[PDB]
Structures are given as structure tokens and as C-alpha cells.
Amino acid sequence: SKTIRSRSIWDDAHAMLEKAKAEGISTVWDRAAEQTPACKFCELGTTCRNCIMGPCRIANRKDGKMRLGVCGADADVIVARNFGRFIAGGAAGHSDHGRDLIETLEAVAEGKAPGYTIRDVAKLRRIAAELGVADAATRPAHDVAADLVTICYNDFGSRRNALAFLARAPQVRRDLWQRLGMTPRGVDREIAEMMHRTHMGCDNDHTSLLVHAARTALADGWGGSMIGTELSDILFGTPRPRQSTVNLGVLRKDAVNILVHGHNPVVSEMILAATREPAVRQAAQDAGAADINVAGLCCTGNELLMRQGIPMAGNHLMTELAIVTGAADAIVADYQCIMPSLVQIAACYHTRFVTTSPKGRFTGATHVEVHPHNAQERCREIVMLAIDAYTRRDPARVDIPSQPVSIMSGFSNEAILEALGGTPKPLIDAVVAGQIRGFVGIVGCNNPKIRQDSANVTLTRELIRRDIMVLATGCVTTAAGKAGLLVPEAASKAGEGLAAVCRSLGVPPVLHMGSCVDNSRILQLCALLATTLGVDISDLPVGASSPEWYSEKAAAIAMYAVASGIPTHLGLPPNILGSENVTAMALHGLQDVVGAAFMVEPDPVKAADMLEAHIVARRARLGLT
Amino acid sequence: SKTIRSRSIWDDAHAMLEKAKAEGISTVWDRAAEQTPACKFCELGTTCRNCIMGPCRIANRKDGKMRLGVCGADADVIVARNFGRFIAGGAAGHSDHGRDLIETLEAVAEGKAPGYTIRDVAKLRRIAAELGVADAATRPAHDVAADLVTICYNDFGSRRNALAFLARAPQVRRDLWQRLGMTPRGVDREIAEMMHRTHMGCDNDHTSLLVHAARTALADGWGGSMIGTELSDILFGTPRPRQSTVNLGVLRKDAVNILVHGHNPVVSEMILAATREPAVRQAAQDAGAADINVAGLCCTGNELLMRQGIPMAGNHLMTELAIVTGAADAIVADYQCIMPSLVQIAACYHTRFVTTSPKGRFTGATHVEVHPHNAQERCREIVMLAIDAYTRRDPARVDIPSQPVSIMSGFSNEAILEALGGTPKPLIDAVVAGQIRGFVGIVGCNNPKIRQDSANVTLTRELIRRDIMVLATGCVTTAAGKAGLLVPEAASKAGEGLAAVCRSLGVPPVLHMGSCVDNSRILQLCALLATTLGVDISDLPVGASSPEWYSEKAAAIAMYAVASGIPTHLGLPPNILGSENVTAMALHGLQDVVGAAFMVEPDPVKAADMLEAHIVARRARLGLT
Ligand code: SF4
Ligand code: SF4
Ligand code: FES
């Protein structure tokens, strides 16, 4: 229908929205329509529930009433406090993700994690030496792991002056954070101090609350997310370039289709291993299946895509539609961005909805809790549930749409530097020469307010055309992939400068750099370039963008990009427009403080113009053409 | 007027409300009226702002729409997540409070905190030995302090299985927390994990979220609050019984009046020490003042009351009215419960409003930031500001309304056990004999929804009539004090059994046990009694009540009281009544799990009936009349 066509740009999504409509299944778009219009105070941020002297709303009335809360807080404080807690929720998701990776590596170091090993021992020694472990190159790998585990855990403590990975930032960027009071000291500490500041009668200055919001988000990018990325590479291998496929067509009628959903790869890496055991493959064969086919959703799909080339089934707004195919025999979920509607839609079919984390509980789900010491045993049990669910699949309701699209994935910073001969010198020369005018990381989510991936794909096309290389992470990866932009042949869709560089390296114009925690790879690349050139990150021709973000995590990623000197664009505004002072600080004031600011622009073509203008100005300050 | 009469039960509050009305000064009651009626969805908790697919509201509509959020969360999840963040904000207040006391003690142990010492070396050695410091009885005091600092910091890390002070709870209670997965592991970790669970698509089971809320609150009472209390006694002294006074009459017309506001006594102890320096006193008398007069507000006033006997000017809803007296020459604030309206009301007078913590910033306030390495220097500077403001006090607008009421304060557990001869046996004997039928800790705030202190005083009167001893902390202290119930002579207002025990020990029927962190003193006392009798805290004839609470911290205290087996009464409900399942869990379901539950009752007499009934049932299970 006209309505179905306006919800997404993808054929596989349209087909499933027709199927869901015919079957009477409501989707995220339907509930988004119901929640429209939204509460004007909640939209603007001028509402507060932090105590039961309230709840309060700030209104502009003729009689001057309701200008302040019961405690006396004005709109600036109330909007800033809400935005501060919004950021802290996002940093906390990445905080727990990074914490689980430390526990897993500690379990490996102690020999209490059957089925886990240190896949990349060379990276473990490099990271441990970088963070100061003594004799990281020669001591036994388990000892080196235990000492890195200790360094990581101490960043989750309250005794550090600065996070351990903060050393990667240029000295000028560290001096700036120090003068401003933004230096992140502890991953959990900043979140706790934010929750304390936003309590009634604590931090009642909107400038102070936003400064600590930056510090909280910086504890994510250079802490929770960076620890998660680096330890994931140690535990499961550093990504290298590889081919794979994307979209709902990666589901097979003839196979047990297991969709992994969530973020943490500690579970899905063992799910994948259980599917390869001979006895488990025998059960699938005894059930009439040709194979066991694992496919990814959202960031845990990105994780298996970067390290294993596991095909990605879809991104955020594709998750419900993947069950509508009738071929999803099991959804295995850990945490974050797993819509509870999946439980009800799975109940419409044979699909087993299996939760695996103590933090990711869903009423009505099948809970098989997974920890490092039992993951190999539990994941074997979970795949068996999927094989059993496969036997009850109704074939008359199976409709897997579309043909999978080829993609190239696995562009970690190690892979990037390897493709350049080992140093960033060829990369820097291309920028100086003007072949690659700059880099933009397009990151983030889908959002029902925006036609699915319309802004992600348009902005990607606009940027590579202007010789601006795109680094894609998160749910943008699937948008760039389904658009055919994640393959080296996509250089024909770039400008002459970017196309020529890409064709000499054999890489696509859009580099898939992983999941949402892997946005720390972009911080690492930016820090590595600024240090080499002897400048700040705010001098590099770079930018960040999330045209269709939804989550608190995307807010925290955008905030730590801005606080790190990266001009960051958002397609939709946060719930802050009720305060002009907070809005001006987010859009303009931060430029005077951290060298970068937020941009809110729903037109992806204007967004490309704005990101390009920042790049052009930074190129001028570097003395480039 | 009739309106002024309905806002408070006290004459000193009535006089300042009459004064503020003639001077055209809006108070917290005026703003509460503007915010009434409140938003229904915010009141019920059935609104969510956790992502920008929303904001969402859950409504009971005839057309069936808006039953779920955009992500699919129902009312049970949305209300439970809101309550979880509500609890986390309260636990974070106490967390940063305890973290600051660890920092002060560490600065003292390092010799980098002029003017601070270890005023109770005896308690330092006892506590450090209790938590496992080697040779704590004989090693140098600073060395023992450094080891206790390390132990305390580790509870602010992520490597422990249980907080250090949890060993105080009886084994049966620790085994229960373990089976339920409620054991608090890290003060900051539980807060960070709660913010992760409440992110979209993580924890979507209201039972699970509520269980982690109890864990998050238990990390407060047995962690942040208990560390804050014990380290404050080590740094500033263990409280002992002493006489003092309460209400706005503690302000002197002929003296420089410095009101200390907030929670942390690291500041106000050095403020008081600054007013006792001879050269500082000479400056006040050279300015025309008879002396410098320090008086307390809220919990930092409780701290100076417990350890120094400093008179208390008032509690929560008295803070604005204390400036309206015209005699408040300076307000010294740290953090929590400091209404931003105090800056505006101080601007109506000569009053200087001074902030001292980097976490408690107020636009327009005079910021003199205090840290252990410069507190002695800065606090002298703050008192000099107070003397200078005193020279500008307009005498025609001064109106100190009442005569202070005598109180007795300082009833730490150490003081209680000393009064009993060193063992709990005389107390246990009184309870077995029926002279003291039970204990109820009356804790918590004021709230404009309830006539100030009307429910606090009425419940306190009702409980001591029934031979139930009351333990008072927080802003209840000022209510019980102004009603004359904090002196030994108040035994005449108690039943025959409690009066006899009180006259025998020479103590009041209401024992002031300190600030809001000092509610950990109540947990310690219950744990000591349960351990001595070989039962659970849920077997003791005990109760908790906050008849006029408002803050997130009061909610957190109530949650860890219930989770520890103490039946807890709230005069007003949290924003949870939009979910019957969550309300039934808090009011009934928790009884089957932790042995206690919440009670919501705005009638203080019925609150006494419910509290007394729980105590009677527990006396029966112990085999008592
Ligand atoms: S903190 Fe202030 S603005 Fe927020 S609900 Fe409480 S009284 Fe209202
Ligand atoms: S988390 Fe769910 S209920 Fe809350 S605002 Fe987002 S979509 Fe709505
Ligand atoms: S729902 Fe209460 S203000 Fe938006």
C-alpha cells in the first residue's frame, strides 16, 4: 500500500509488512502511529519525574505560573538533567557490555571458560604492553591476560585519575579535557555521579550538567566501548576483510534458521560453535534440515559479520519482519534494542524466543542463562531447541523474500593499516592530495519517524560522491550493504578521487568497521591520525552522523564524538528543544569549548552539505586545498 | 490565614509564610499549587522517555490504542523501569556521599588534608579489623586507614561477590539474597547495571527489574550509606548523647548566622572549625556581632547535631523560611535537597548563598569549591563572606519567630550499647518482657502534599503510646524535636512499658540516630539483634516509615529496608500505580520473597495500626505475648 511503501525503502521490508498486514500482526510502525502525536512536554524535555514533590511540567503561560518546578528548578536545569540521564543510560549499556567482556577474558585466563580461548594472542600482548603490563611480549599469555583484566577492572573502579585508553587521544585533546573537567575517571563512576547530579537539589546549573554529560559519554567511548572492542578482538579474533551477504534472503527454507539478536558476541560466538558440532548437525539432519543456518540481527550480527562473515539478516526495524518470514526457528537474544514485541510475534509462529542474559529478561521468553563457565553446554542446548522448533514450522506460512546482497566486511583499524602497507602514510597522502577530502562515520539506528534507511543510504551516497569516505557501523551497515555500497565495485558511485584510491586498494568506498562499541575504532583511527600529524582531533577533516538514531546509546556515541572534536550530525533532535540555552549549547556553545558541536538536520542532502562544510574548513586550517 | 495554617503545624513556619506573603515571596507551597493538578501519566508512572522512538504513554482507551510503547513495552515494564531509575538516583546520592568520605579519609591517611584528623582511632581499628585489615589493632593509624580506604574503594569496583559490610547481616538473610540474586556486588555497579536494564530492549520483565531495584538499593544501605556513616564517625567522631535545640529560634539577632545545608559533613565540620578560630571571631565582633552562630539544615545539620550538638534551624520545608527570617547571613551548601529557589530568596535579602561541591552547582550562587587539601583555607574564606554579609543585614526585615525547643541527640549504636552496659541483653529483655513491644524507624522528608510534619508527629505520638520505641533520622528529627519528643521527659507521653525503660536508661522515647545515611545504623542494629537471637531481620519486631517522603533517596532507603526484611510504610505512593502488577509486587508479592513489603497509607493512625500489626505478628512467631 501507499502507507507500507512509506515505511521503508527495501523490498524485503515491504513484502513482510504486507504479510504482517494480511496476518493481523502489528509492527513497530503501527505502535509508532498510535503514540503520535506525542506529549508536548516529554517531546520538549520540559517535564520532570525525579521526585514526588512533582511530577512537574514547565509551561509558558500568560499568568506566569508553572515557570519552575516545585523545587524551583527552571527549564534549563530540567531539560539538562533529563538529557544527562538520557546519556547515562546509553553509556551504561556499553559499560555493561565492556564489563562482560572483562569477565569472559578473566574466565579464559583462569581456565574456567570451556570453549573459549585467546584467539588473537598477538593483539593481547600489544594491548597489554600499551596499557603497561610488565613483560607483555614474553610472559605466559594467561598471565598477560590476567594483568590486562586487572587494568580493565580498575577503569571500572573509583581510584583512577583518567581512563587507561585515554592515552590514545592527542596530548592537546587530553589537556583540553583536563582544563574543562571532562576527563573520564571511571566507567561506572561517571554514570553514578550523573545519577547523583540529576537528583533534586544537587546539580542545578545546565552548563555543569552538560559538561558532565560529555565526561560520562567520554567514559563510554574511551572506556566501556573501547574495552569491549579490544577485548572482543582478543577473545574472538581481529576482523579482516571478508565477503558475506545481507537482508532477509539469507534465511533458508531448507535449514534451521537461528537468528542471533542483541549486542554481546560472547553468546553468539558459542551459539555458532555449537551449530558446528557433529552431533548437533546430526540432529538437524535427523529433523529433515539440510544445515543449521545462523544469521545476524543488529550489533551481535555485526560482530559475527566482522569476525566470521556470518550473513546479516537485517537491522533494527527489520527484526519483527524477520519473524514474519515464517522461517525464523529461533531468536537468541542477549540485551539492548531487543523489542519485546518479538515475543508476541514469535508466539504467532513456531519461533522459539530464547533469552541468555540475566540482564535481558523478557516475560514469556524461554530463558537459558549463559555464562562463560557453562556457555558451551548451554549453547548446545539452545541450538537443540531451535532444531526442535524447526520441526513444528508451518511451511504454508513461509515467505522468505528477496535475494541476498553481497557485502565486504571486517575493516578494523588493523585491517585498514594493513591495506595501506602498515602505516597511515598512504592514507594521509590521499587526504593532503585531495583524493579523499575527508572521512565521515555514519553510525546509529533506524527510527519509525524516518522512512527506513532512506536517510542512511542518501547521506552515504551524497558523501562518497563528494570524495568523502564513509565508515559505517551499527544498523547503518545493513543500509549500506543492501544498497550495494559495501563492495569494491561500488567505487563507481564515488567521486574520481575516492574511486581511484579505492580501486588501488581494492576496498569499497564505504568501510564496515563493526558494531556500536566498534565506534571506538573510529576514535582510535582519529586519535592515531591527529597524533601522527601533531594536531588535535578537532583539526582533522572528519565528521560523524546518525541520520535515523533512536537509542540512548546513539546519544552517548554522538556526545563522545562531539566531546572528542568530531562534528556530529543527528537526523532528529533529542528531547531538549524546550530549553533554548541547552539547545544553543548543544548546537553552538560546545564548538567554543570542545571544538565540535551537534547538528540536527532531517534532510540528508543538507546534512551532507553541513558535514562537507566542516571538513572544508578543517582542510583550510591544515593548509590544504 | 486558613491557607497558611494548612501548610504547616509549626508557628515558626506560619510566621515566615505570613512574612513571605506580605513581601511577595513565593515558596515551595506556592509552586506545588501551580503544579497541581499533575500530569496523570507521570503520576501513574505510565509514561516513558527512554528513547526517541517515543516518548510514549500507556493509556486505558476504549479503542485499545496506546496499550504498548513503540518498542512494545507494556505498562508493567515501563512502570518498573521508571521505578528502577528512581531508586538508582537515590542510591547514587548515597554512593557519591560515601565515595567522598573515602576520599577524605585517604587524604588524611596521606597527610594531604590540613585540619582533618582521625578523631576516632578506636573505631577505625575496630572497623578495619572487622573488614579484615591485618593487625588493625597495633599498626600505625594512618596505615590502617589506608588499608580500610582500599577495602572501601574495592566495594566501588566490579570485582567482588558481595559488599564488605554485608557480613553484618545474619547468615539466613545472606543466603536468601544469594538464592534471589539480590546480593549487592558493587556500589556503583548496581547503579550502572540498573541504567542498562532500563535501556530499551534490555530488561523487559517487571519482576526482574524490581529484583535488581532491591539489589541496587541494598548496595546503598549496606554499601554507600554504611561506608558514609562509619567513615564519618572515624573522621569526625562517634556520636554520644548530648543536649541541643531546634527550630528557627536557634538563629540569633545579635550574631552572624551561618546556615549549613546539604548532606556531607566534610564541609560543615570545617565551616564550624573556621567559626571557632580566634581571628575569625575577632572579625565578627569588629563587624558588630556578638559571635558567629552556626545552625544546621537537613542532613548536614543532623551530622553537626549528632557530633557537635549544633542547633538545627529546620528541616526540608523550613529551608526557604529560614532565609525569610532576615537573619540568615549565609547559606553554605554542598549537595542534595538544596532547592534552587534558595538562590532567589537569598537574592531578596542580604544572604550569601555559597556552594562548595563540584556536584552541587547553582546558577547565580557564589561558588567556593571545597576539597580536603584546601578546606581549611576555603572555609575560613566562606565564613569571612558571612561576616561581611552580616554588615548588610536590614534590621527592619528581621523576624526570628520562635523560642528554640530543647532536644537530645547523638544516639549511635555505640551510644545505645554503652547505655545498655555493653551488650544488647537489657534491650532484648525489655522486648521479651513486653515493656518495649517493638521498634519503628521513622525516617524521611517533608512533602508539600502533606501538611508539614503533621503525619510525622502524629505517627510518632501513636507509636510511643503503644510502647513502640521510635528511631528518628533525617528530617523527621526536626519534627520529633519541635514536638518535644526528643528529651527524656517525653517518657510521660509514652505507654507504661516504654516510659519505664526510658526513665531507667534516661533516654527519650524517640532516639535520634542521625542523618539519612545513618539509616545504616538502623540496619546494623537489626543485624546485631537478629544475629544475637539467631533469627532473620524479618523475624524481629521492627518497622520503618516515611510518612512525608519526597526524594529518590527516601525511595531507595525504603527499598533496602524492605529488602532486608523490615516492613516499610510510605505516606505517599511512588509513581507506580499505573501498573497493578508492580503495585501488587511492592505491596504484597515482596512479602513472599524478602519477608517484608511496602505499605502506602496517608492516615498516620492507620499507619500505626499496620506497623503495630506487623510487629505483633513477629512477636508471635518469636513466641512472645
Ligand atoms: S526534582 Fe524538582 S522539578 Fe523535578 S519533579 Fe521534583 S520538584 Fe519537580
Ligand atoms: S523505550 Fe519503548 S516505551 Fe520507552 S520511549 Fe522508547 S519506545 Fe517508548
Ligand atoms: S506524560 Fe507526563 S508530561 Fe509527558
Author numbering:
A (entry chain B), B (entry chain A): 4 to 628
From the study:
The anaerobic, Ni-dependent CODH has a homodimeric structure containing a total of five metalloclusters, called the B-, C-, and D-clusters. The C-cluster is the site of CO/CO2 interconversion and is composed of a [Ni-3Fe-4S] cubane connected through a linking sulfide (SL) to a unique iron site (Feu). Here, we report the crystal structure of the CODH from Desulfovibrio vulgaris (DvCODH), which reveals a surprising and unprecedented conformational rearrangement of metal ions in the C-cluster and provides the first visualization of the cluster in an oxidized state. The overall fold and cluster placement of DvCODH is highly similar to other structurally characterized CODHs.
In the present work, we determined two structures of as-isolated DvCODH using two independent protein batches and much to our surprise, we observe different conformations of the C-cluster in each structure. A 2.50 Å resolution structure of as-isolated DvCODH (determined using protein batch 1) displays the canonical [Ni-3Fe-4S]-Feu C-cluster; the [Ni-3Fe-5S]-Feu state that was observed in structures of Carboxydothermus hydrogenoformans CODH-II is no longer thought to be catalytically relevant. The ligation of the C-cluster is conserved in DvCODH with four cysteines ligating the cubane portion of the cluster (Cys519 is the Ni ligand); one histidine (His266) and one cysteine (Cys302) ligate Feu. One noteworthy difference with respect to other CODHs is the identity of the D-cluster, a solvent-exposed Fe-S cluster at the dimer interface that serves as an electron conduit to the surface of the protein. Instead of the expected [4Fe-4S] cluster, the electron density is consistent with a [2Fe-2S] cluster as is the placement of cysteine residues in the primary structure. CODH sequence alignments reveal that instead of a C-X7-C D-cluster binding motif, DvCODH, as well as several uncharacterized CODHs, have a C-X2-C motif. This shortened C-X2-C motif appears to constrain the geometry of the ligating cysteine residues such that coordination to a [4Fe-4S] cluster is not possible.
